Amino acid sequence: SGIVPTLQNIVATVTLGCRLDLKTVALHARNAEYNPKRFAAVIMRIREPKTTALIFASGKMVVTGAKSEDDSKLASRKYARIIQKIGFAAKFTDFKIQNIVGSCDVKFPIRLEGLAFSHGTFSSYEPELFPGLIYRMVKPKIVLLIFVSGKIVLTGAKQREEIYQAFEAIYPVLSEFRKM
DNA sequence: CCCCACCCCCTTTAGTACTTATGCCTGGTTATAGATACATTGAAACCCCTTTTATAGGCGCCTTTTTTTTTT
């Protein structure tokens, strides 16, 4: 294909192994918002790497927004370090990436309804609901959002390799339905 | 002094008409069992809260601009 999808977002979970007083975290950490009435967790953001963590009373958290596996682990470590610095027996445990999202640009337009009619068992296209075509790939198990513009969204991957393999697999069919 | 006649009685049983109690059946409302109106406390079942990064239509709602109609 000659193109390599760009990783745009990585979601990871981390068990800090120790109960937390969310009310206290929200009070001593900067850039933290806590509104239990709507979500039972403290939302905290940091600038390097630019990410957002969801911290729970159970001591477990979700780190989002990271653009690489390293930034994800690194950011996760900083959040844990803050929880500690606040006064908890937090530890960096069970780090695990749960989802990777990537995007592409094949540069050419795509006749989506032709692609949907051709691959009916994998794609759901109804512009009324959503402008992009939803392609549910089997191997690897990656969901793609194909747009008329040639823009491609790939998600559902746990290894960055799946995004790459998903894109290579779809390129031929994308090319086949190129508007030209 | 004797004979005959008249008066007074008790004997018990058969008749059908009339009165009283029992069985009959009949018009209210009261006392029973269960469900209904429904209302009870009990519980489970439900949506709700922390965000990200990109794609791109439709969606509703804001203040400022231009056009049309009315009045003087």
Cα–Cα distance for residue pair A43/A55, rounded to 1 Å: 6
Asked if strand B contacts A37 at the CB level, meaning under 7 A, the answer is yes
Report residue A95 as tokens: 């780090």
Contact, A9 vs A101, CB < 8 A?
Answer: yes
The Å distance, CA of A134 to C1' of B35, is 58
Give CA–CA dist A19/A90, Å, rounded.
8
Strand order across the beta sheet in which A50-56 lies: A32-34, A41-47, A50-56, A60-66, A6-15, A93-105, A151-157, A143-146, A130-136, A123-126
Bridge-partner residues for A33, per DSSP? A43
A1-11+98-180 matches A12-97 in fold = yes
Residue A33 CA and nucleotide B46 C1' are separated, in Å, by 26
Q: In angstroms, how far is B38 C1' from A29 CA?
A: 55
Resolution, given in Å to one decimal, reads 6.0
Any strand B atom closer than 7 Å to A108 CB: no
Enumerate the H helices of A66-138 as residue ranges.
Answer: 69-86, 112-118
Contact predicate A169/A135, CB 8 Å: no
CA distance A25 to A87: 9
The reply to whether A65 Cβ lies less than 7 angstroms from strand B is yes
The strand ranges marked E within chain A are 6-15, 32-34, 41-47, 50-56, 60-66, 93-105, 123-126, 130-136, 143-146, 151-157
Three-class SS of residue A80? helix
d(C-alpha A114, C-alpha A34), whole Å: 47
Domain ranges of chain A: 1-11+98-180, 12-97
Domain at A12-97, CATH homologous superfamily: TATA-Binding Protein (3.30.310.10)
> Residue A51: what residue type?
T
CA end-to-end span of chain A, whole Å?
18
The domain A1-11+98-180 is placed in CATH, from the list 3.30.310.10, 3.40.50.800, 3.40.50.1460, 3.20.130.10, at 3.30.310.10
